[PDB]
Amino acid sequence: SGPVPSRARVYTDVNTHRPREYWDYESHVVEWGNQDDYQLVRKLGRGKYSEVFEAINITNNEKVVVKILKPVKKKKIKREIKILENLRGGPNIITLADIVKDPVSRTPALVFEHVNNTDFKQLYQTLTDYDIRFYMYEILKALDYCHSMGIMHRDVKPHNVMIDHEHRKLRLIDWGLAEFYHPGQEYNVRVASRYFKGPELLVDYQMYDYSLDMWSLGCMLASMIFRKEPFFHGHDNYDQLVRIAKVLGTEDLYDYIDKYNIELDPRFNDILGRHSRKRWERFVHSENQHLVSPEALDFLDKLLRYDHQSRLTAREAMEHPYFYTVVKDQARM
Ligand SMILES: Brc1cc2nn[nH]c2cc1Br
């Protein structure tokens, strides 16, 4: 018999109550502008995949970022555009300024509000205790907003968080894997980067939701408070679940498998073995102990659960004692 169905605990039906045009991105008609309104200044280091440039808007001499959409289904292009349009003006969501095509090549490009080219990965192994809490709270604002708007990011990782540390400003970027949540929809599990993949992706449970992003967030938090990059260091997608099992233990993993009647790929049979759930003190040492608190560990524990339904929602996360001083100080300013 099949896997047991699953539903998001929050924001379950938000897209159903919207007009069809909100989430039906395949039918979205794009008015493509002219990339000649923009002059490329330089290529921003975003990996081997990426074609992201600093550019100038001629009209007003404003600095922008241009992302040339490397050849991919028009469907995926429409999806990223519709999601950016839907979330525009949301807290800590990157602003889509324009949608253009090179007149010669006809290659589609996205034009964004300028951000400094400093991703969170360059900074997140050097933060104070307070700044980890502050920036985690800022990421949660973006995730609670996109979840509340019926969208899961599905690629939450340090490289997709742009920070202006001087101005204490943060933007969640690269909405290219983001998808609308629809109750009962089975999604592609080939999303997110290896180290940030939730167990649902690794065991091929397709009826997942916003809670995927909360696992990724847990992986970033663990990396920051323990100064361990990445926290779950798998050699591949199979070994990734072994690395998780060695920390969260195998008892809760098999309970999860049983609960959702998941058919476990037989390759897992010999490699998962038997592991106790490890106490977090195991990862604490002299060079990270100033970042680790009971509050931090209680919060982290409630993000990193096999059972996606069990994980804190973004809003529940924002209400955790870990953030009380950040909440207090925000209200004060
Ligand atoms: Br920098 C930058 C990189 C991005 N990748 N995907 N969207 C993006 C927006 C900005 Br701004």
**Beta carbons within 8 Å of 325's beta carbon, 6+ residues apart:** 130, 133
Q: How distant, in Å, are the alpha carbons of 142, 165, 227, 310, 324 from that of 328?
A: 19, 20, 27, 27, 6
Ligand 1, pocket-test mutation among 67, 146, 164, most atoms within 8 A of CB: 67
Distance 288 CA to ligand 1 centre (A): 31
Q: Residue 314: CA atoms inside 13 Å, Cβ hemisphere, count?
A: 28
Q: Would the annotation count 319 as a binding residue?
A: no
Give me the residue spans of the domains in the chain: 6-23+115-333, 24-114
DSSP label at 264?
-
Please say whether the beta carbons of 22 and 48 come within 8 A.
no
Could you tell me the two tokens for 55?
């550019």
Q: Residue whose CA is closest, atom 9 of ligand 1?
A: 173
Helix (H, G, I), strand (E, B) or coil at 217: helix
Header resolution in angstroms: 1.9
How buried is 103 (Cβ within 10 angstroms: 0-12 exposed, 13-18 middle, 19+ buried)?
A: exposed
Q: Which H or E run contains 325?
A: helix 324-332
| 3-state secondary structure (DSSP) of residue 195 | helix
Whether residue 174 lies in the annotated active site: no
Residue nearest to atom 5 of ligand 1 (CA): 174
**Which residue is associated with the tokens 């924001």?**
11
Q: Is 177 near ligand 1, meaning CB less than 6 Å away?
A: no
Residue 67 has φ and ψ, to the nearest 5°, of -110, 105
Catalytic residue among 119, 131, 144, 155: 155
Which residues, 6 or more positions from 139, have their beta carbon under 8 angstroms from its beta carbon?
92, 156, 161, 170, 172, 217, 220
Has 141 been labeled as part of a binding site?
A: no
CA distance 297 to 299: 5
CA distance to 63, 125, 191, per residue, from 155 (Å)? 26, 20, 7
